Design a protein around this ligand. Structure first.
Ligand SMILES: [K+]
Ligand SMILES: [K+]
Ligand SMILES: [K+]
Ligand SMILES: [K+]
Ligand SMILES: [K+]
Ligand SMILES: [K+]
Ligand SMILES: [K+]
Ligand SMILES: [Mg+2]
Ligand SMILES: [Mg+2]
Ligand SMILES: [Mg+2]
Ligand SMILES: [Mg+2]
Ligand SMILES: [Mg+2]
Ligand SMILES: [Mg+2]
Ligand SMILES: [Mg+2]
Ligand SMILES: [Mg+2]
Ligand SMILES: [Mg+2]
Ligand SMILES: [Mg+2]
Ligand SMILES: [Mg+2]
Ligand SMILES: [Mg+2]
Ligand SMILES: [Mg+2]
Ligand SMILES: [Mg+2]
Ligand SMILES: [Mg+2]
Ligand SMILES: [Mg+2]
Ligand SMILES: [Mg+2]
Ligand SMILES: [Mg+2]
Ligand SMILES: [Mg+2]
Ligand SMILES: [Mg+2]
Lengths: 184, 200, 261, 147
RNA sequence: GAAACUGCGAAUGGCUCAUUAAAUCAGUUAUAGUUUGUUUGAUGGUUACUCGGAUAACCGUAGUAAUUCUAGAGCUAAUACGUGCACCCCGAAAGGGAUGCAUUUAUUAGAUAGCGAUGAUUCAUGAUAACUCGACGGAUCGCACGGCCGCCGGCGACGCAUCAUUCAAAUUUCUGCCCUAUCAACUUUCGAUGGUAGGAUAGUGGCCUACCAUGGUGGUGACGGGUGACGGAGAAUUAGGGUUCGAUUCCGGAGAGGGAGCCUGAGAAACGGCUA
């Protein structure tokens, strides 16, 4: 099957390597997961070397995404893949891979923001909410996309390895870099 | 074509051989697990319903459920599944074997039938005498269920009901009873206390 | 190979076992255990080749299966159990108790011990690090793991372990001026005072050891085992006391022995 | 800027969108640029501590450790992107004739942007994990030719 | 105590030298680049007086010329199989949420010269926000019987998980190999050299994909060809230097008529395993 050996490769000088042994099981590869966005979740258990387990996600619809500046992590639905630095063909196929830029539902984060800052984007409770509002700052670019209900996010996990699609909300200059790529 | 007729309720079974093609027309084109009426199979079978469980072709190859063909095919089978016993073979070993399809056809050499509903007249040797079960329940829960026992009622006092007594050729008397499994005894409670004690 | 080798050819066995080359095609394959296969002495060798209690491979199994042999205070029934340096072997029926120490020629010697001295052993600390829940622990070169060690204990130190309480009684810091024994290499079995430590970043650390007679020899840090603080070891040493004599000196003693004996 | 690829390049573990300021914090914390000392007596170039380049293979600001053999040689080729060919010259002893013959070996090595190198310059390379099909070394110091 | 289920082993050993010329292999390195049944040491939170359904042996109807080829029916077990007692946030400070271990992501601490280690790691490890449709957290067995007035309790066996250790592997650094130039250029569309982002893998890596750059090797012999070429420890002969040999019992590698593919498993691209 798929092999990761260097025997089939040419030498650094360019000369060929004559085969001297058969393929080994300890240097094998496997078919790519090609995880897609779909409500029909499907993750298949794979038995790997040492009796360990790998989780290969074929279809995913929700992920655990973290808002770094606010230090809050919430489970949210994955809506669409918008950018992929490796191959643009992975965007129109809606493939979930690490470092892919996707849009996630903003509703879970809006609820926390209202519950935390008392703002939309009980005597002791109001005492602390106003206290936390003094040091409240929200990026204009980040706030602009809360109205549409979608947040640009980057996948930080490997769905074909761990079976999950987790990531973080884009912000700062990283958000500026990617939104410029999408401005056409 | 021969027929292996078995009566699950009575535990008896018998082999029937039929050569009349017109009588076999009822079974032809049928599949496994389907029910066939015995009215056309004969006069003594009036009111009987037979379920097709399987059979073997003239070459001895068995029929496999799900093979929607009348001929023979070669399949890669797993050990322990029907049509591949795989005794004395490596775990995870697969073998390619020939299996007849699940559709009944004149090419078959024998059919296994199960009586799902008896008719008017009881067949001889199939519904006349009931063969008792060789062994009684062995698990503690099953014994209580069999005799409708309660939590407080003892279970080991009822296993003697189906105790088997016999005489050996070299001896005169011998009785054997099963060992009750999953029976709560003082030793079992002691083990549980020790295991909890270790955690503390 | 497609996996693990279960056989040891006799010529491939460690030389310090002193196995006759024509005794057979195979040697006892050391089982996995606290000590490495190349730095151990299987119980079969000890009971049959060293102590002569057993005359054959079969008789060793009989002795061990009766639970008559203990290593580090615990009964061992494995014929190829890897007993190693500083291990205490006890045989209650014979009232004997030995400690595995290298003689000056680099071979394991069954040093008879008194009853009082057979209640502890020395272990070399491999490393100290935090475990799960932030609990510090240290592991030794004999496969032992001790939790909640003294904070002063560091890598390469020696700890006195009590075989009854299974706790660290005392420890010796690894520093120049202590008496140490060489546990590997050419100088295996030699005892001297650690005189210097030469560190080389990214490479092995060299240690200079001076014998009681002024002979100085070097070795790697991994082959050193501190025996005591100052100049007195905490364990009983064999007659040689780690003093390596020249072949000329050894021949001189042999000649004198014949004249007297 | 250093952002020239299709993806956004950044150091892993360095959060650039923190409300608090990184003033008074160690490298790699509070959004501060991350750098480290490789040991073995080698100095961290000022261009790596105060630079803005992103290189995960950099020995000082990347995710590669130096361990193994430290070698020296002369830069033979500097045409690849962040990779150079180091020529190592040595003498091979011919036993029968009790004499020597000049031999050489070309060792591919990764060079971080903090280093400036030209053909003929003397370089020191430290071993690291495989970075490519042929690269197993990272440039640690560059001495300009004629210096 | 036969049989049978379950467990484990059969990946060692033995045999051979066909392929293979910086490849194998040798000495010497690295894994801060990974997996590792077992051994050894340590470590696993503040219906339950014990659950459910199957199946073998057995029993009895059989088919086929035929095979540890095979179908149907009646029974009954488990350490088989499937289940199941088992500080932070919100907040009218009540109450509630989360709260074992493992998994995945993000934020944060890991100082200085309470606060561990390295030549060197945002390392060991801690805290926090969530996440997973988690083969995990004992429904097991032997012996001995005692101590309290139903309670409590001994010494073992087997098994699950984590770390370290041991037994090992994989990949890997530097140097080193016979004849041939009547072999001088070779490599790169379809990976050749390198870069970025991914995929795959136990894990590093053009190992593979997309995109980008135009590199990489060579009279210090690349590339190609020859070998009646497995490499080494070694063998013969040797004043010295040297010449020749090394299929074969030790070590390493490779193969099981030729290829390829694969299951099981801690470990095999296994062949006294399977598939073509
Ligand atoms: K191997
Ligand atoms: K096995
Ligand atoms: K080597
Ligand atoms: K060689
Ligand atoms: K890899
Ligand atoms: K690449
Ligand atoms: K196994
Ligand atoms: Mg039981
Ligand atoms: Mg072998
Ligand atoms: Mg080191
Ligand atoms: Mg069996
Ligand atoms: Mg050639
Ligand atoms: Mg080489
Ligand atoms: Mg960490
Ligand atoms: Mg990569
Ligand atoms: Mg490409
Ligand atoms: Mg040869
Ligand atoms: Mg040949
Ligand atoms: Mg040879
Ligand atoms: Mg030959
Ligand atoms: Mg032979
Ligand atoms: Mg061999
Ligand atoms: Mg093979
Ligand atoms: Mg042949
Ligand atoms: Mg094969
Ligand atoms: Mg054979
Ligand atoms: Mg074989």
């Amino acid at each position: 099957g798929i092999s990761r050996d260097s025997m089939h490769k040419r030498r650094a000088t360019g000369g060929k390597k004559k085969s001297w042994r058969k393929k080994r099981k300890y240097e094998l590869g496997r078919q790519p997961a090609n995880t897609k966005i779909s409500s029909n979740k499907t993750v298949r258990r794979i038995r790997v070397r040492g009796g360990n387990v790998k989780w290969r996600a074929l279809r995913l619809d929700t992920g655990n995404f973290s808002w770094g500046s606010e230090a809050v992590t919430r489970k949210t639905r994955i809506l669409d893949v918008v950018y992929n630095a490796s191959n643009n063909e992975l965007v129109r196929t809606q493939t979930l891979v690490k470092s892919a830029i996707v849009q996630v539902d903003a509703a879970p984060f809006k609820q926390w923001y209202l519950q935390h800052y008392g703002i939309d984007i009980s005597n002791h409770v109001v005492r602390k909410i106003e206290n936390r509002q003094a040091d409240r700052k929200l990026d204009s670019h980040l706030e602009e996309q809360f109205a549409s209900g979608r947040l640009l996010a980057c996948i930080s996990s490997r769905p074909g390895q761990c079976g999950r699609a987790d990531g973080y909300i884009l912000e700062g200059k990283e958000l500026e870099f990617y939104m410029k790529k999408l401005q056409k | 074509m021969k027929f292996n007729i078995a009566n699950p309720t009575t535990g008896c079974q018998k082999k029937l051989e039929i050569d009349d093609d017109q009588k076999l027309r009822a079974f032809f084109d049928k599949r496994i697990s389907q029910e066939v009426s015995g009215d056309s199979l004969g006069e003594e079978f009036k009111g009987y319903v037979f379920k097709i469980m399987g059979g073997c072709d003239k070459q001895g190859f068995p029929m496999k459920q799900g093979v929607l063909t009348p001929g023979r095919v070669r399949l890669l089978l797993y050990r322990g599944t029907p049509c591949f016993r795989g005794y004395g073979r490596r775990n995870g070993e697969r073998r390619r074997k020939s299996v007849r399809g699940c559709i009944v056809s004149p090419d078959l050499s024998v059919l296994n039938l199960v009586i799902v509903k008896k008719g008017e007249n009881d067949l001889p040797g199939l519904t006349d005498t009931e063969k008792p079960r060789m062994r009684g329940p062995k698990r503690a829960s099953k014994i209580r269920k069999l005799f409708n026992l309660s939590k407080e009622d003892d279970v080991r006092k009822y296993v003697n009901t189906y105790r088997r007594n016999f005489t050996t050729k070299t001896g005169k008397n011998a009785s054997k009873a099963p060992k009750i499994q999953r029976l709560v005894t003082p030793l079992t409670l002691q083990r549980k206390r020790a295991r909890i004690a270790d955690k503390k | 190979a497609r996996g693990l080798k279960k056989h040891l050819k006799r010529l491939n066995a460690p030389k310090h076992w002193m196995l006759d080359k024509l005794g057979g095609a195979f040697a006892p394959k050391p089982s996995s255990g606290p000590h490495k296969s190349r730095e151990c002495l299987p119980l079969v060798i000890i009971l049959r080749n060293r102590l002569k209690y057993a005359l054959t491979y079969r008789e060793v199994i009989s002795i061990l299966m009766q639970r008559q042999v203990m290593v580090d205070g615990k009964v061992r029934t494995d014929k190829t159990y890897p007993a190693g340096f500083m291990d205490v072997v006890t045989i209650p029926k014979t009232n004997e108790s030995f400690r595995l120490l290298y003689d000056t020629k680099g071979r394991f010697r069954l040093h008879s011990l008194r009853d009082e001295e057979a209640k502890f052993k020395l272990c070399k600390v491999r490393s100290v690090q935090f475990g799960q829940k932030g609990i510090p622990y240290l592991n030794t070169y004999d496969g032992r793991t001790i939790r909640y060690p003294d904070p002063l204990i560091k890598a390469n130190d020696t700890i006195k372990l009590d075989l009854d309480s299974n706790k660290i009684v005392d420890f010796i810091k690894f520093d120049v001026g202590n008496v140490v024994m060489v546990t590997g290499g050419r100088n295996r079995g030699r005892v001297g005072i650690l005189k210097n430590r030469e560190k080389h970043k990214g490479s092995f650390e060299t240690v200079h050891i001076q014998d009681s007679q002024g002979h100085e020899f070097a070795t790697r840090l991994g082959n050193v085992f501190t025996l005591g603080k100052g100049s007195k070891p905490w364990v009983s040493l064999p007659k040689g006391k780690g003093i390596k004599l020249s072949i000329i000196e050894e021949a001189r003693k042999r000649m004198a022995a014949q004249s007297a004996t | 800027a250093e952002q020239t690829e299709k993806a956004f390049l950044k150091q892993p573990g360095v959060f650039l969108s923190s409300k608090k300021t990184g003033k008074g914090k160690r490298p790699g914390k509070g959004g501060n640029r991350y750098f480290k000392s490789i040991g073995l007596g080698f100095k961290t170039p000022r261009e790596a501590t105060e630079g803005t380049y992103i290189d995960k293979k950099c020995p000082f600001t990347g995710n590669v450790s130096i361990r193994g053999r430290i070698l020296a040689g002369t830069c033979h080729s500097a045409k690849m992107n962040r990779t150079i060919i180091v020529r190592r010259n040595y003498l091979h002893y011919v036993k029968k004739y009790q004499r020597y013959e000049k031999r050489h070996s070309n060792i591919p090595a990764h060079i971080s942007p903090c280093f400036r190198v030209k053909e003929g310059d003397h370089v020191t390379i430290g071993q690291c994990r495989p970075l490519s099909k042929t690269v197993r070394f990272n440039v640690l110091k560059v001495i300009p030719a004629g210096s």
